[PDB]
Amino acid sequence: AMLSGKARAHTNIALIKYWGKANEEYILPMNSSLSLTLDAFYTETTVTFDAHYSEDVFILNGILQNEKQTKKVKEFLNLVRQQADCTWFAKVESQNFVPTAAGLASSASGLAALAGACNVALGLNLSAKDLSRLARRGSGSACRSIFGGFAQWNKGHSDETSFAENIPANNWENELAMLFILINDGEKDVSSRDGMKRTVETSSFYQGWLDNVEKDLSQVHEAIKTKDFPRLGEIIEANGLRMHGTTLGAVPPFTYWSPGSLQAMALVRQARAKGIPCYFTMDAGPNVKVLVEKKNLEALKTFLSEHFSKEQLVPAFAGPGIELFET
Amino acid sequence: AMLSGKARAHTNIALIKYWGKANEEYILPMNSSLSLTLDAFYTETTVTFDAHYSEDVFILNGILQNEKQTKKVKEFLNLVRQQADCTWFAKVESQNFVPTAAGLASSASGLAALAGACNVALGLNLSAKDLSRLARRGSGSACRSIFGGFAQWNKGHSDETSFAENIPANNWENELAMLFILINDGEKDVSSRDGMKRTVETSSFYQGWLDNVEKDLSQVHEAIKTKDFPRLGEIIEANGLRMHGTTLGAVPPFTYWSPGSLQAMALVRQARAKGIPCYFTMDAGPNVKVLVEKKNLEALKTFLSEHFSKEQLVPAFAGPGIELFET
Ligand SMILES: Nc1ncnc2c1ncn2[C@@H]1O[C@H](COP(=O)(O)OP(=O)(O)O)[C@@H](O)[C@H]1O
Ligand SMILES: Nc1ncnc2c1ncn2[C@@H]1O[C@H](COP(=O)(O)OP(=O)(O)O)[C@@H](O)[C@H]1O
Ligand SMILES: C[C@@](O)(CCOP(=O)(O)OP(=O)(O)O)CC(=O)O
Ligand SMILES: C[C@@](O)(CCOP(=O)(O)OP(=O)(O)O)CC(=O)O
Ligand code: BEF
Ligand code: BEF
Ligand SMILES: [Mg+2]
Ligand SMILES: [Mg+2]
Ligand SMILES: [Mg+2]
Ligand SMILES: [Mg+2]
């Protein structure tokens, strides 16, 4: 009496950021977002539900996770169990091919892969739409890792209408790269979930953020239609800076930046001045991600090596949607 | 046929920031501000108007200033000349006992000292109120260096009503210190005047800034009434962070921070966690200024020496108002 399943999901990086929930229970976002799924980082997860298990068990990178580290996996497992009317405890075993809790979207690949493995094991036969919707309840960003290439999370207005979808771009995404500047792969002080909740509830800058998201999304859609890389870059760099500005208006204010983050952003501006078209974005952590055309990637790498070791510069290209597996 | 005068003015540091002009021509501010005048940094300036001069001449730290570097001194000189109906060119010779254009308020001490020297030479006999009003037209922050200790610039609504005044604090200001962490004493890329104009005109965060200034000013007045150092510190640290957040929402966005700025702010938070009550503020530049009680100043210095050389840590205490001199 056991049910099992397996999934691989890749990370994605938001070009237009999700920042702040309109509904915390269902993870419905205050604004829509738009991401690129990436080939270099991903999560592989298997789940076993079994009538003979005595408790939920979560093993991550071969390490048993403690109660605090398992509380959220357990919340997700409770959701999918009530959805299927399944009364069995489960065993989640996951491997992160990505640093955990470092602002590199391990929650997106991780909860997408768990949603996909649960969907298989409990035989939910979810459409891509509905798998995105379920992943969303584990981590907002996970609903976008269901898809490859460019994807857009439409905020919708309810559990039924908030989910992601692929953005066809005439394979423009295969002409692009994202170069990761790893400043610190440690676990962040302020989780994405806690930071954005603080911003929503207290930041005096949060209305400015919201007032600009839809304009940015449109500009990105028109730049994708016209394969305008500089215009894409200018929008997403400013969107990233705008999102991080909101945390300086929170009460108390905080920042995700470290000193190396600012050094890397200044260098990206220097690369641009010396003729390398490239543009930075950041997420909830100190690492800096640089959007650049494949043409210019080794150029950028060599420029950036003047201040960063080779191990600090990880390239990534467009990646695939979720892959489900029977076991 | 010559008229001469001399003045010394000290810098001040804004606890509640002036950021953005409501009237650029007269330098009337969008919000009121509150500063502490400091003993360690100052400017000494002499002016000579003389019928035999053939042009305005500005010498700063013994270096002749070129046209671009003199354009603003000339604007001020034109103002005071039209005010007095004086048709003579002038010679301004100034010494900055403070780094110039580095976010350490050289414009406040510098234009205050020029206003004071012009007032003497042309025999304007200005009250403190009216000397603050004239200094204001040279640099907003200069209207506060007319006074010592705590001072408040009331935004008013016109040239007649926008000016500063001393804030009596039962000599609380003599129990305080400001420790300067010098990250870079070079001249800034984005002048205070250009940066705040960019923020006013384009930043989506500028309304959040304005919506919080008066609350902060009141909290500072109540903390001064009750000599509540931790409450003073919490307000001014957040006010500083809020002001700098506005530049990340500008179009294009920019920051005054450098990597060392973030390192210093994180250390100040570490000093606080290890039992040293202290609080950081920043102005339009990368240097970090730390408010601390005199009791705790050597403690802070020793803590900060773990990452900064002794030459990078300049203490300053409450300072005096402007001093006028006949020549
Ligand atoms: N493979 C995984 N399976 C389950 N939960 C995961 C996995 N990887 C990460 N997480 C969860 O995501 C949290 C980090 O989320 P977040 O703060 O959004 O960081 P990140 O920037 O890596 O997404 C981890 O602390 C953990 O709770
Ligand atoms: N002693 C002085 N006399 C006249 N003008 C001065 C003097 N010191 C500084 N300034 C003016 O102030 C400008 C710097 O202003 P600002 O950008 O506000 O920098 P800061 O943070 O030093 O005030 C200088 O470039 C110069 O035009
Ligand atoms: C800055 C961001 O990376 C924040 C991601 O937030 P999460 O999706 O990680 O948070 P939860 O929905 O609470 O799981 C921007 C983005 O990924 O869209
Ligand atoms: C961040 C600040 O230091 C900005 C000072 O701006 P300035 O008064 O130097 O600018 P102008 O009025 O154009 O001469 C905050 C403050 O001093 O109040
Ligand atoms: F990608 Be993480 F959620 F900042
Ligand atoms: F004090 Be400066 F004008 F930033
Ligand atoms: Mg993410
Ligand atoms: Mg995440
Ligand atoms: Mg100043
Ligand atoms: Mg100034």
Size of the A and B interface in Cβ pairs below 8 Å: 75
Taken as a whole, chain B contains a residue count of 327
Which of B144, B17, B120 has the alpha carbon at shortest distance from B327? B120
Rounded CA gap, B78 and B81, in Å?
5
Dihedrals φ, ψ of B78, to 5°? -60, -40
Please work out whether the CB of residue A221 comes within 6 Å of at least one atom of ligand 3.
Answer: no
Question: How many CB atoms are located within 10 Å of the residue B166 CB?
Answer: 16
A257 vs B: CB within 8 A: yes
Beta bridge partners of A13: A36
Binding residues of A for Mg(2+): 107
Which of A4, A92, A93, A89 has the alpha carbon at shortest distance from A55? A89
Rounded CA gap, B98 and B283, in Å?
15
- The answer to whether the beta carbons of residues B266 and A189 sit under 8 Å apart is no
Residue located nearest, by CA, to atom 6 of ligand 4: B192
B230 vs A: CB within 8 A: no
Query: For residue A258, which residues of chain B lie inside 8 Å, CB to CB?
Result: 262
- Structure-token match 């109540």, residue found: B222
Identity of the residue in A248, A258, A263 whose CB atom sits nearest the CB atom of B245:
A248
Rounded CA gap, B316 and B314, in Å?
7
Which of A254, A104, A281 has the alpha carbon at shortest distance from A190? A254
Amino acid present at B17: K
Query: B259 vs A255: CB contact, 8 Å cut-off?
Result: no
- Residue B204, C-beta contacts closer than 8 angstroms, at least 6 positions apart: A205, A208, A209, A211, A212, A242, B249
Residue located nearest, by CA, to atom 11 of ligand 4: B139
Rounded CA gap, B88 and B183, in Å?
42
- Residue B82, C-beta contacts closer than 8 angstroms, at least 6 positions apart: none
Residue B127, SS3? coil
Radius of gyration of chain B (CA): 19
Token pair for B100 = 């110039």
Amino acid present at B83: Q
Residue B74, SS3? helix
- The answer to whether the beta carbons of residues B66 and B206 sit under 8 Å apart is no
Which of A266, A279, A272, A301 has the alpha carbon at shortest distance from A220? A279
Rounded CA gap, A171 and A150, in Å?
10
Query: B205 vs A249: CB contact, 8 Å cut-off?
Result: yes
Question: How many CB atoms are located within 10 Å of the residue B294 CB?
Answer: 12
Amino acid present at B82: Q
Rounded CA gap, A62 and A53, in Å?
19
How many CA atoms lie less than 13 Å away from B305 in the CB half-sphere?
Answer: 9
H-only helix segments in chain B: 67-84, 106-121, 128-138, 192-202, 206-225, 229-245, 259-273, 297-304
Rounded CA gap, A244 and B244, in Å?
12
Alpha carbon A163 to its chain's center? 14
Which of A10, A254, A194, A274 has the alpha carbon at shortest distance from B241? A254
Identity of the residue in A204, A242, A259 whose CB atom sits nearest the CB atom of B259:
A259
How many CA atoms lie less than 13 Å away from B99 in the CB half-sphere?
Answer: 18
For ligand 7, an ion, list residues with CB under 5 A. Answer: A 105, 141, 283
Please work out whether the CB of residue A33 comes within 6 Å of at least one atom of ligand 3.
Answer: yes
Residue B141 assigned to a binding site: no
Quote the crossing angle between the two packed helices B67-84 and B106-121, to the nearest 10°. 40
A-chain residue closest to B241, CA distance: A248
- Structure-token match 């300086």, residue found: A248
Token pair for A170 = 């005439």
- Structure-token match 């000397």, residue found: B131
Which of B325, B322, B327, B326 has the alpha carbon at shortest distance from B131? B322
Rounded CA gap, B1 and B35, in Å?
39
Which of B22, B27, B24 has the alpha carbon at shortest distance from B137? B27
H-only helix segments in chain A: 67-84, 106-121, 128-138, 192-202, 206-225, 229-245, 259-273, 297-304
Which of A33, A68, A22, A7 has the alpha carbon at shortest distance from A283? A33
Rounded CA gap, A302 and B25, in Å?
48
Which of B9, B17, B32, B322 has the alpha carbon at shortest distance from B162? B32
Identity of the residue in A245, A257, A259 whose CB atom sits nearest the CB atom of B249:
A245
- Residue A178, C-beta contacts closer than 8 angstroms, at least 6 positions apart: A13, A36, A38, A289, A290, A291, A292, A315, A316, A317
Token pair for B105 = 């308020």
Question: How many CB atoms are located within 10 Å of the residue A307 CB?
Answer: 13
Which of B108, B99, B157 has the alpha carbon at shortest distance from B135? B108
Token pair for A150 = 């460019």
Give all domains of chain B, ordered by start, each with its CATH number: 1-181 (3.30.230.10), 182-327 (3.30.70.890)
- The answer to whether the beta carbons of residues B42 and B97 sit under 8 Å apart is yes
B153 vs A: CB within 8 A: no
The helix or strand, by DSSP H or E, that contains position A152, with its residue range, turns out to be strand A150-154
Query: For residue A245, which residues of chain B lie inside 8 Å, CB to CB?
Result: 205, 245-246, 248-249, 253
- The answer to whether the beta carbons of residues A133 and A65 sit under 8 Å apart is no
Token pair for B96 = 């900055």
Q: What separation in angstroms does the CA of B220 have from each of A59, B214, B228, B230?
A: 51, 10, 9, 11
Which of A162, A70, A158 has the alpha carbon at shortest distance from A114? A70
Q: What separation in angstroms does the CA of A107 have from each of A13, A178, A197?
A: 11, 19, 16
Query: B207 vs A209: CB contact, 8 Å cut-off?
Result: no
Rounded CA gap, B220 and B230, in Å?
11
| Surface-to-core class of residue B234, CB atoms within 10 Å of its CB (0-12 exposed, 13-18 middle, 19+ buried) | middle
Which of B4, B34, B29 has the alpha carbon at shortest distance from B19? B29
Query: B241 vs A262: CB contact, 8 Å cut-off?
Result: no
- Structure-token match 């009003």, residue found: B133
Query: For residue B252, which residues of chain A lie inside 8 Å, CB to CB?
Result: 234, 238
Rounded CA gap, A24 and A196, in Å?
11
Contacts 24+ apart (CB under 8 A), A302-306: A303/A267, A303/A270, A303/A271, A303/A274, A303/A276, A304/A179, A304/A181, A304/A264, A304/A267, A304/A271
A136 vs B: CB within 8 A: no
Which of A163, A147, A116 has the alpha carbon at shortest distance from A321? A147
Rounded CA gap, A34 and A141, in Å?
10
- The answer to whether the beta carbons of residues B264 and B181 sit under 8 Å apart is yes
- The answer to whether the beta carbons of residues B116 and B131 sit under 8 Å apart is yes
Amino acid present at B184: N
Amino acid present at A232: L
Token pair for A110 = 């991780």
Give the pairing type, strands A278-282 and A288-293.
antiparallel
Experimental method: X-ray
B208 vs A: CB within 8 A: yes
Radius of gyration of chain A (CA): 19
Top residue of A203, A242, A269 to mutate, by most chain B CBs within 10 Å, is A242
A251 vs B: CB within 8 A: yes
Rounded CA gap, B231 and B226, in Å?
10
Residue B96 assigned to a binding site: yes
Question: How many CB atoms are located within 10 Å of the residue A130 CB?
Answer: 16
Token pair for A289 = 């991600």
Beta bridge partners of A90: A49
Query: A242 vs B262: CB contact, 8 Å cut-off?
Result: no
Rounded CA gap, A112 and A26, in Å?
15
Residue B51 assigned to a binding site: no
Which of A27, A6, A28 has the alpha carbon at shortest distance from A114? A6
Rounded CA gap, A74 and A109, in Å?
17
Peptide bond just before B252 cis, omega within 30 deg: yes
Which of B24, B30, B35 has the alpha carbon at shortest distance from B214? B30
Residue B162 assigned to a binding site: no
| Surface-to-core class of residue A199, CB atoms within 10 Å of its CB (0-12 exposed, 13-18 middle, 19+ buried) | buried
Query: B208 vs A208: CB contact, 8 Å cut-off?
Result: yes
How many CA atoms lie less than 13 Å away from B72 in the CB half-sphere?
Answer: 13
Quote the crossing angle between the two packed helices B259-273 and B297-304, to the nearest 10°. 130
- List all residues whose CB is within 6 A of at least one atom of ligand 2: B 43, 45, 60, 72-73, 94, 96, 100-108, 110-111, 114, 191-192, 283-285
Identity of the residue in A212, A244, A253 whose CB atom sits nearest the CB atom of B248:
A244
- The answer to whether the beta carbons of residues B45 and B110 sit under 8 Å apart is yes
Amino acid present at B135: A
Token pair for A185 = 């792969």
A-chain residue closest to B202, CA distance: A208
Question: How many CB atoms are located within 10 Å of the residue A114 CB?
Answer: 30
- The answer to whether the beta carbons of residues A167 and A151 sit under 8 Å apart is yes
Residue A88, SS3? coil
Question: How many CB atoms are located within 10 Å of the residue A64 CB?
Answer: 10
Residue located nearest, by CA, to atom 1 of ligand 3: A283
Give the pairing type, strands B90-97 and B57-60.
parallel
